[model samples]
Target: PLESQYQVGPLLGSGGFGSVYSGIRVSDNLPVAIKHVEKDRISDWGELPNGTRVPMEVVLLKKVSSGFSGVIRLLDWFERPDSFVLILERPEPVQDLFDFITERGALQEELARSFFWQVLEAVRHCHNCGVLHRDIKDENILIDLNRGELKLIDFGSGALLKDTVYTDFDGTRVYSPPEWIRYHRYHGRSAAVWSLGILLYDMVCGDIPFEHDEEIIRGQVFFRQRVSSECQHLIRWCLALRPSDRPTFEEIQNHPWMQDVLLPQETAEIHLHS
Candidate 1:
C-alpha cells in the first residue's frame, strides 16, 4: 500500500474519468503512476446496479492482465468514500500510437508488421482470459518510447465477455465496426480484429478508412463499398461484419506481412526522473 504523503508531483495526463499524477513510494521512493478516479465517474454508470461504485473497469483490468505478459503492471489500489486511486508502474518516456505516428511518421512495413503481431498476441491473451477490450484504439495503446515496449492501458470501456452482451455504442467513433453501431452482441474477438485492422491501416496510410461523419459512416459500412486494395484484403478479413467470417489472431500472426518482419530492438532500461 502507498503512504498518504508520497511526494506526488506534476500531472501526467487526464482522461474522461480520471487523471494520472507522477508520484513516488515513500518507503522505497520508486516512481509510480497514480490514477485518481472521481466519485461521480465511479457512481453513475446506468448499466450497473445501485451501490456499484466499483468500476467494471477495475475488474476487467485485473482479470485481463492476470496472466498476460508484455503489458503494464498494476501495482496496488485504494478506495476512499468518494474516490479511488490506482497505483501503476510508470513507464518513462511513454507514448501512445497517436503521438508515436505523429513524431516518427508512418511505421516502416517491417516495424508495423512486428507491432501488429505483438498486438495480436496481446489481444489473443485477452480473449483466452474472457475479457473484451472493447475500446482498442491508438490512444489507448501506450508505448515505452525509450524501451520499444508497447503496453495496452485504459480499461474504462472494457468488459468480461461472459458477463456482458456489450450492446453499448462505445469506443472511438471512427474505428467502431458496423455491427457495433447496430447494437448487436458481437464476438469480442472479431471486434478486436476490426479495431486492429483500422489501427494497422492508419499506420500504413496515415489516415482512417472512415471519416468522422456518423451518417456517412453508417452508409459506407452498410453499403459495403470496399476500400482500396493496398492492404484491403487483410482489412476486409478483419472488418468482416459477421464475427464468424473474421480470421483468428493465430491467422493474423502468421500472415505473410507479419511473419517476415524484423522488429525494433528493445533498449536498455533507464531510470525515470521526477
Candidate 2:
C-alpha cells in the first residue's frame, strides 16, 4: 500500500540498510526519494499517542524538522512485511557533495563559504532540538550547485543529546576528532566544529588533511592549495588540538571572514516535503 500514489523508478543508491529509489508522486507528479531499509536494521522505535509504532528516524526527523530549514525533509513513511519505507522530498537536479567534489575536484572558497553558513545553521537547529547528527561530512551534504543551496542528510548515525560527552561512536572513521580517538569519547558540539574544519579543508584541497587517526589526533594537517587568509585562520582555529579551543557557532559566524554574510539567524518555516 505504500507508494500507492507514486510511480516507482529505478534505484538511486544502495547500502547495507537497503536501496533508495527515485519515484514520481502520481497526485502531483512530484519527484521523491524512496528509502527501503531492512526491518532488521531499524534499531529504534517509539509509540504514538494513538499507539502506532514509529521508527526513531521518523520521530527524530519530525522533531528536528518541526520548523527547521537546510535539512532534508521527510514527507511520509510506512512499514512493509520485510522493511521500513520512507518517502523524502527530492531536491531536483541536486548532487551529493561527494560526487560534486569528485567530478569537479576541490571547490572554490567562494562557493564553500556560502555553504558553510547553511551547514552551521542546520547543525545549530539540530542541536537546539537535542539531536546530534554525530556524522557531518561531504557525502551527507547534498548541494544544488547553481543556486548554492545545501541540505544536510543521512541521520542514521544520529543520537539524542544524552550529554555533551559521549562514548558511543558510529561516525566516519577518518573524520572522527582527536578527543574521540584519544579518550574514547567526544563532546558533540566541539567534535562537530572540528568536523566542519575537516569539511572546509577538504573543500579547498580536494582531500582530507590527515593521514591517519594519529595524525588527526596529532593535529597533522597541511593544505594542498593556498586559501584566503581568514579562511585559513578559521580552519586552524577549529582544528585546534584541544577541543576546548574550538570556537562556538556564534563565534564562527562573527569571525571577520563571515562578517559580511550576517545570516538573519531566524527560525525557519516547517516546509517539509517541499
Candidate 3:
C-alpha cells in the first residue's frame, strides 16, 4: 500500500528509533516525510476504535495536529510486519532551530523573541489539545527561513496530557527540567516550561544554559551574551530550581519579554550579520 500510494525516496535522517525517508504522494505528487520504525522500538501504544494498535506518537499527532501551523501533521500511516510507516507533511526549504542558531552563532533579542513566541504558541496548542510534547528542543523545531514560521516536529516522545506528575521521561537531557532529575517526577506543563527556558536561552545566547546535571539542579543560568533584562528575567523565571516556582504558560505569555512584541516586526526584514 505504501509503495503504491507513495514513492519512498532517499533517507533524510536516522536515529536509534528509525530512519526517515523523503517521499512523494503518488496521487498529487505532494511531498511527504516517511518514517520507518521497528515495532520493538515503540515503547508506548494506543488502540483505535477498530482495535488497531499504533504508536502513541501517531495517536497523539492524530489528536492534536488539526490546522495547527506549529505542529507537523500526519497524512497517513501503515502497519508493516516488522515496523510502522508514517507519512508526514514535509515543509520544504526549512532548517532546524539548532542549525539556525549554529550558523548565526546567536540571535538578536527581537528576532529571538519572535521565534520564542511562536514556540510558546506551539507548546500551548499541544497542551490545549490534551497532548504533551515531552521533547521540545531546537532540533525538533523546524523553521522556514523566509517566513520564520516554526513547525514543531518529532512526536516520538509524546504523551497524553495529565494533571499528575510524570515519573518517566525520554526527552533530550539538556532540555529536561531539574525536578525530573531530583524527585523523579514532573507535572506536564512545568516541565515543558523548563524546556522553553532552555530553548530561549539557546536561541538568544548561542548555547544551552546547562549541560551537566549539577548545573541543571542548581539552576544557575549564566548568560554569556548580553540579552535584554526582560529576556533574562523571563528565562530565569522559567529556570527556577523548584518546579513549583516556574511560571505557567499564561504567565510566560504575560511576561514583559513576551508582551513587548509589536505587530509590524517583519521577520524577513531583520538582518543578522555578526
Candidate 4:
C-alpha cells in the first residue's frame, strides 16, 4: 500500500517499538521518514471505525503539533495487515542529537543554549496542549546539521497529562528525578526539569552529570567544562532536589541566563551579587 506512494529504502534505525525507513515520494522528489510499527507490540492505540488501531504516539503528535512549529509533524499513515507505516516529515540536512553530540564531543555554549531554548519551547507548547513528553532525551531530538534548529520526535513514551501523580513512566532511567527513583512517583514537571537538566549538562560538558541515582539524590554534579555562571545557576536550579524548587518553564524563559535586554535598575539590582 505504502509502496504506491513512496519508494522505501534501507532502514534508518530501529527501537524496541519500531523501525524507521528512509523514503522518497513518488509524486515528487521530496524525502520522508517512514516509521513501521507492529500492531501487537504497542498497547496504547486508538481504534478506528473499521477496527483500525492507530498508535497513540501518532494521535498525540497530530493533536499537539497541529499548529506548533517546533514539533515533528506526521504527514500520513497507512494500515497494513500486521503493521502500520507512518510517513513523517524529514527536514533535510538534519541529524538526531545523539549523532550531533558524538561528532562535536560538546557543543558551543551559545549553540547549546539555542537548542535548549527550542526544546523548552516545544515542551512548554506540549504542556499547554495538556500533553506530557515523558521522554526528553538527546536521541529523540533532531537538529539541523548546519543551523542547529531542533525538532522533538519519538512520541512512543508520551501521554496526556494526568496531574502530578503519574505512576507508570516509560522514559530512560538516568533522567528520572530523585522522587521518582525513591518513591516510584513524580510530577511531570519535576521529571521534565530533571531530564532537561541532564540534556543541558550533556550538551555543554560532553558527559552526563550523574552516573547513578545516588549522585542525583545528593545533588552533586561535576562540571567538566567552563560555562557562564548564569548558565550554571540555571542548570543547577533545574536539578533541584525538591520538585517545587525547580523552575517552571516560564521561569526558565525569564532566567538571567536567558536575559538579553536591559531590566529596570530595581529588577537588575535584585540579584546583582551574591
Computed on alpha carbons, the lDDT of every model, listed in order, comes to 0.66, 0.78, 0.87, 0.80
lDDT of 3 by residue, 204-257 (tens): 999999989989999998989998998999999999988889999899999988
Model 3 misplaced regions, further than 4 Å:
260-265, 269-274
Ranked by lDDT, the better of candidates 2 and 3 is 3
Give per-residue CA lDDT, model 4, range 220-263, as digits (tens).
77788988898889899999999999998889889988755323
Best of the two (1, 3) by lDDT: 3
Write down the worst ten-residue block by lDDT for model 1: 265-274
- Model 4's alpha-carbon lDDT is 0.80
lDDT of 2 at 245: 97
Which is the better candidate, 1 or 3, if ranked by TM-score?
3
Question: Tens digits of per-residue lDDT for model 2 on 48-121?
Answer: 55778867677767667654548888888888888888888877767888887787787666556666778888
Ten residues in a row with the worst lDDT in model 2?
A: 264-273
Candidate 3: give the clashing pairs. Answer: none
Q: What is the number of backbone collisions in each predicted candidate, taken in the order shown?
A: 0, 0, 0, 0
The most accurate candidate by TM-score is: 3
Candidate 4 ranges with C-alpha deviation above 4 Å: 47-52, 261-274
Ranking by lDDT: 3, 4, 2, 1
Supply candidate 2's per-residue lDDT for 151.
85
Of 2 and 3, the candidate ranking higher by TM-score: 3
Model 2 Cα RMSD, 1 decimal: 4.7
Q: Give the higher-lDDT candidate: 1 or 4.
A: 4
Q: Which of the two candidates, 1 or 4, achieves a greater TM-score against the reference?
A: 4
